Amino acid sequence: MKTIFSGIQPSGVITIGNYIGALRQFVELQHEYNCYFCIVDQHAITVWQDPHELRQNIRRLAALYLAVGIDPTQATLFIQSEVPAHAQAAWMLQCIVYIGELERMTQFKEKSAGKEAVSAGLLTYPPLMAADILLYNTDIVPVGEDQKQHIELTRDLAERFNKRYGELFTIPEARIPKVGARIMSLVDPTKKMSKSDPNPKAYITLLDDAKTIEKKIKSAVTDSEGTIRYDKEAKPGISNLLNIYSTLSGQSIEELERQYEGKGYGVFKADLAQVVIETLRPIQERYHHWMESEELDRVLDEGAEKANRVASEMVRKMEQAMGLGR
């Protein structure tokens, strides 16, 4: 069967945008593919991290993955740093990528914007992501739209390596949701919902309580049409709300538009907030159980064992192809 790989950075804020664009895909696809889901801690350190928060955020993210329903018997869940192959593969790929290719990455340009003094990990972020994916002979990489370009570069690297050293890598392909590929800020619906937004009202975290979710949904910027119709360009706010509602409820955009024919934003928002709470509650309760269990570490231990067996062998093949070592 085919292989899937996907990663998420461990951080203080895991949003419903991460859930809808990614985690929901992981759970959907886990039984049909060989799955590798990673907590990308080495990618997290591309920007300064408080060490204590990082260690906690890594456990938090593992807990959320399992809380959302990632099943360790169906998928391999692990921490990037615990599989040395990623760093090994990243170095080899860094040697074949051009500086200009890295410089044109939008993620890099955005994260480095208006900085003095940019840390190099930010620039070399892609080769490490390419190594993440290529290590496992990945076919499909389920992500939100913001990762598309990185995966395009990964494809370029895989092809370059294969041309130079002999066919070794499978050329991976992004799988990006039709609806919910890019969940926007509740505060400014022309902007992507980001885990680093200085305004906490811009995102809903997976651990937000009911009152908080209600406040954030109610406050979500809309328009003065009082019409619940999807129109990304004309009604960015309501359209984004419709995407969240659709993806989380399972109802189609058309279904919701009819359901709310003649209705105002007030009833819509109240109903949406209930849909968000309904989604998050069971996740939160499963999350706290994981956070207090010794089983969390056992799952990660098993995930790292499997990941290492696979990635280490690919690293051997990579080295043999380039002539490194012996």
Ligand X SMILES: Nc1ncnc2c1ncn2[C@@H]1O[C@H](COP(=O)(O)OC(=O)[C@@H](N)Cc2c[nH]c3ccccc23)[C@@H](O)[C@H]1O
- Closest residue by Cα to residue 83 from 52, 140, 40: 40
| Ramachandran quadrant class, 180 (left: phi over 0; alpha: psi -120 to 50; beta: rest) | left
| From candidates 16, 35, 40, 280, binder to ligand [N+] by CB under 6 A | 35
Stretch that binds ligand X, among 71-79, 142-150, 233-241, 244-252 (CB under 6 A): 142-150
**AA identity, residue 113:** A
Q: Name every residue whose Cβ is closer than 8 Å to that of residue 148 and which is 6 or more positions away in sequence.
A: 174, 176
Residue 17 binding partner per list a copy of itself, ligand [N+], ligand X, none, with a CB distance cut-off of 5 to 8 Å that depends on partner kind: ligand X
192 a catalytic residue: yes
Which C-beta is closer to ligand X: that of 204 or that of 299? 204
Give the single-character DSSP code of 185: P
CA atoms within 13 A of residue 309's CA, in its CB half-sphere: 7
Q: Which does 30 bind (CB under 5 to 8 A by kind): a copy of itself, ligand [N+], ligand X, none?
A: ligand [N+]
Q: Give the other-Cβ count within 10 Å of 106's Cβ.
A: 11
163 is an active site residue: no
Residue 6 sits in the site that holds ligand [N+] (CB under 6 A) = no
Contact 8, 38 (CB under 8 A): yes
The CA angle 244-247-249, to the nearest 5 degrees, is: 95
**Region of residue 114 (phi > 0: left; psi between -120 and 50: alpha; otherwise: beta):** left
Which listed residue (192, 216, 235, 269) is catalytic? 192
Q: Which stretch binds ligand [N+] (CB under 6 A): 26-34, 46-54, 100-108, 303-311?
A: 26-34
The three-state secondary structure class of 34 is strand
Chain residue whose CB lies nearest ligand [N+]: 74
Enter the DSSP assignment of 33.
S
Residue with smaller CB distance to a copy of itself, 1 or 120: 120
- Which residue among 192, 216, 235, 269 contacts ligand X (CB under 6 A)? 192
Residue 215 beta carbon to ligand X: minimum distance, rounded to whole angstroms: 20
Side-by-side strand order, sheet with 75-79: 75-79, 34-39, 3-8, 140-142, 173-175
Task: Answer yes or no: is 17 a known binding residue.
Answer: yes
Active site annotation includes 232: no
Which of a copy of itself, ligand X, ligand [N+], none has residue 21 at its interface (CB below 5 to 8 Å by kind)? ligand X
Pick 35 or 151: Cβ nearer ligand [N+] = 35
192 in a known ligand binding site: yes
Q: Which does 18 bind (CB under 5 to 8 A by kind): ligand [N+], ligand X, a copy of itself, none?
A: ligand X
Spatial distance between the Cα atoms of 172 and 154, rounded to a whole number of angstroms = 8
Q: Quick one: 76 or 154, whose CB is closer to ligand [N+]?
A: 76
Q: Which residues contact 130 (CB under 8 A, 6 or more apart)?
A: 89, 90, 93, 97, 150, 153, 154, 157, 158
Place of tokens 């790989």: 5
| 34 versus 222: smaller Cβ distance to ligand [N+] | 34
Binding-site residues for ATP, please?
Answer: 9-11, 17-18, 144-146, 183, 192-196
Positions annotated as catalytic residues are 111, 192, 195
Sites of contact with ligand X (CB under 6 A): 5-9, 17-18, 20-22, 40, 43, 129, 132-133, 141, 143-144, 146-147, 181-183, 192-193
Residues that bind ligand [N+] (CB under 6 A): 30-31, 33-35, 74
